[PDB]
Structure 1
Amino acid sequence: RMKQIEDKLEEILSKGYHICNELARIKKLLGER
């Protein structure tokens, strides 16, 4: 269970990196307009 907590924390962090990378690409393509 403490392992499944540690697993979920890393899943949340990763996805937050993923999300903020997707928004960074979106910001990029709109600034080049």
Structure 2
Amino acid sequence: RMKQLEDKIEENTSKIYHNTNEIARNTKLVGE
């Protein structure tokens, strides 16, 4: 199971990575 769990953690890390970039884009677009 542990390798799969490491898989799942990495899938979450990747989703977070992309979300962080999208948030940054929104932050810039709402900024003055």
Structure 1 stretches of 4+ with a deviation exceeding 6 A read none
The Cα RMSD (Å) is: 1.2
Please give the TM-score of this superposition, normalised by the length of structure 2: 0.72
Residue of structure 1 in register with 2:16 after alignment: 16
Q: How many residues align?
A: 32
List runs of 5+ in structure 1 lacking aligned partners.
none
Please give the TM-score of this superposition, normalised by the length of structure 1: 0.71
The offset of 1:30, in angstroms, is 2.1
One-letter code of the match for 1:22? E
List runs of 5+ in structure 2 lacking aligned partners.
none
